[PDB]
Amino acid sequence: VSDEEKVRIAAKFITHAPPGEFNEVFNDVRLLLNNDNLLREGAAHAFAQYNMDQFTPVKIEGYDDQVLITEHGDLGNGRFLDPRNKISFKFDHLRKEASDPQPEDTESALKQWRDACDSALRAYVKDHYPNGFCTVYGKSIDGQQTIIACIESHQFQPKNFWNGRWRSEWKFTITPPTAQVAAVLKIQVHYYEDGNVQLVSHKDIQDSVQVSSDVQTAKEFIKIIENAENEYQTAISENYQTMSDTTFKALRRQLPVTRTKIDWNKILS
Amino acid sequence: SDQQLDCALDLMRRLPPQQIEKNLSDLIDLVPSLCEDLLSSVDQPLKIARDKVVGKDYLLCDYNRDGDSYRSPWSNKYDPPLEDGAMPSARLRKLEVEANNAFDQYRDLYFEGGVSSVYLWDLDHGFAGVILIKKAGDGSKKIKGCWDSIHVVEVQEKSSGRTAHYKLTSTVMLWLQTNKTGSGTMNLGGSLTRQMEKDETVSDSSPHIANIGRLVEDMENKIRSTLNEIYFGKTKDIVNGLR
Ligand SMILES: [Ba+2]
């Protein structure tokens, strides 16, 4: 198997690190590949893709709250946009370090919609997620004005050998008098205090809403998000119950229909 | 190459358990020299083949593999046919047949369907074997499910001969996948491994198959409860901690 294949496999594994376990997986993959220069060349894109896929939140010196690393904030050449603070910053994907904040702008047509939606969203997020973070972008994409709202919330407990993260991405395409809504909600949990167990879940959402002013419509946007995220969370818990009490039992009973453990002398006779 | 092997095993504890066979294959391509070490230390999802002579399914794993063929526990031959595939002694084959019939009944009682297979092999001072059970749900239900049990037992038969030491290493892999309007797609997957060791009287009142049966039953019941607690308790608690 060629060096090109090996580093393809290395890059893939790195992209599949569970939330909160990047360092562990990277060091494993580094020592197995055992060719740092090849790793740097064939797999650099993977470090960046992981953080953007994960919506990694980052602290920036001099600014309150945290900003998400997403594709929507990628400015090229290692820099990312903080659209709330109106700055760009260099991001080190390996160390997860923000540096060199510089003043920036991008879109301004949607400045007021982005600002209305961010204010409404930030309150929503801080109300519903223990340590949630959000970043809201406004862009023209393939012809159309789009508000994109990203939400992240994680709980890492490496000393109890578990990690979890929630991500949701909500795209509002503004074609007054309506906005089309497309979203994907994601959850990932890894528990390995015993042996490897993971929950991976996603849900796609499609809706539409009536646009008015920036303020009223932001409110409308948040109501849609709040309801769908509540709906999804309730449904996840309902499904666990069905699984725990029905499907699981259908794989293996606790005990045989005899309602006691096995009479082995009967089996063998 | 111990550092590399440690990294390989650790990595397997972290990659998504839904992709085991693929990940192990990729991991060996990544470190070819660690192949035998990894095939020997990482459990793989069980696969089904058909024994057409007896009309019964049987289970494939590395324990009944010789080259690119697999041995049926029903007919005691390899598919494809081999020149000299590894086979048990006559003595051990009789025990293998009895264990397959015992575990079919055990499977019927606890699982009410699925497939079982028992493969035994001779050792210098006793024998060893694997008891395999695979049950899948009804895949017309919005909630799909697979359970694989892989129970390795190592028996040191002590001269004499009315005593033996049993070591049992058991892995259960459990996967559940649902696709619902309300919860979108949920995929819950993983595995738990446990080990035990015990000395037992071997007699007509307590033959090897009864001793092994009780160890497997005790262990699998315990693993089922642990899975119940982790899958539907602990991961659910984590999700609800996120929002
Ligand atoms: Ba082994």
Author numbering:
A (entry chain A): 8 to 276
B (entry chain B): 2 to 244
The authors write:
The actin capping protein (CP) specifically binds to the barbed end of actin filaments with a high affinity and prevents the addition and loss of the monomers at this dynamic end. CP is a heterodimeric protein composed of α- and β-subunits and the molecule displays a pseudo two-fold symmetry due to the resemblance of the tertiary structures between the two subunits. CP caps the filament with its two independent actin binding sites at the C-terminus of each subunit (“tentacles”). V-1 and CARMIL proteins directly bind to CP and inhibit the filament capping activity of CP.
With the exception of the mobile “β-tentacle,” CP has been considered to be a rigid heterodimeric protein that is stabilized by many intra- and inter-subunit interactions. Superposition of the two structures was poor, with a root-mean-square displacement (RMSD) over the Cα atoms of 2.55 Å [residues 9–275 (α) and 3–244 (β); the “β-tentacle” was not included]. This unexpected finding indicates that CP has conformational flexibility. Therefore, we conclude that CP conformational changes are not induced solely by the binding of a ligand molecule but show that CP is an intrinsically flexible molecule. A domain motion analysis revealed that CP comprises two structurally stable domains, and the conformational change can be attributed to a twisting movement between the domains. The larger domain contains roughly two-thirds of the CP residues [residues 1–258 (α): 1–42, 175–192, and 235–277 (β)] and consists of the entire “N-stalk,” “α-globule,” and “β-tentacle” motifs together with parts of the “central β-sheet” and “antiparallel H5s,” whereas the smaller domain [residues 259–286 (α): 43–174 and 193–234 (β)] consists of the remaining portion. We refer to these larger and smaller domains as the CP-L and CP-S domains, respectively. Each domain superimposed well across the three forms (RMSDs of 0.80–1.06 Å for the CP-L domain and 0.80–1.04 Å for the CP-S domain). A structural comparison analysis revealed that CP consists of two rigid domains, CP-L and CP-S, and undergoes conformational changes even in the absence of a ligand. In addition, we chose CPβΔC for crystallization, since the “β-tentacle” does not participate in the CARMIL interaction. All of the crystals were grown under conditions similar to those for the ligand-free CPβΔC, and the structures were solved at 1.7–1.9 Å resolutions (R = 0.184–0.213, Rfree = 0.238–0.263).
